[PDB]
Amino acid sequence: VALRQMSCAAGTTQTACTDDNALAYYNTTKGGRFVLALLSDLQDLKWARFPKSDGTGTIYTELEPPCRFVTDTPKGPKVKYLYFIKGLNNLNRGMVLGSLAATV
């Protein structure tokens, strides 16, 4: 199944997660949707925060230290930061990496 991306809130601490300032890659299967990684312009992110499906509150997902990579833009180069969800397996790491490098 193809990787999907969606805006989400992230922060250097959990309380710092209020506005949408990253993109989440997620898979959807039988079990629901599973977020695999975050892409952001910010380099200090530690937590991603998601609106619970049932509207009962929020989920905090721990991030790994980011990988840096450069992309060209109409305004020139720009570094972006890829945060895998902590403990992400290798198959899912690959899917994010191949989706990312492909589109960009």
Tokens read off for 42: 């910010």
Q: Is the dihedral of CA 94, 96, 99, 101 positive or negative?
A: negative
Radius of gyration of the chain (CA): 14
What is the spatial distance between Cα 12 and Cα 49, in angstroms, rounded to a whole number?
11
Resolution limit, Å: 2.1
Q: Which helix (H) or strand (E) holds 103?
A: helix 90-103
Please tell me the experimental approach by which this structure was elucidated.
X-ray
What is the spatial distance between Cα 73 and Cα 71, in angstroms, rounded to a whole number?
6
Residue pair 85/35 in contact (Cβ under 8 Å)? The answer is yes
Which amino acid, 38? Answer: L
Facing residues of 11 across strands? 47
Nearest CA among 42, 41, 88 for reference residue 63: 88
* Letter string b/e over residues 37-52, b meaning 16 or more CB atoms within 10 A of that residue's CB: bbbbeeeebbbbbbee
Residue pair 37/96 in contact (Cβ under 8 Å)? The answer is yes
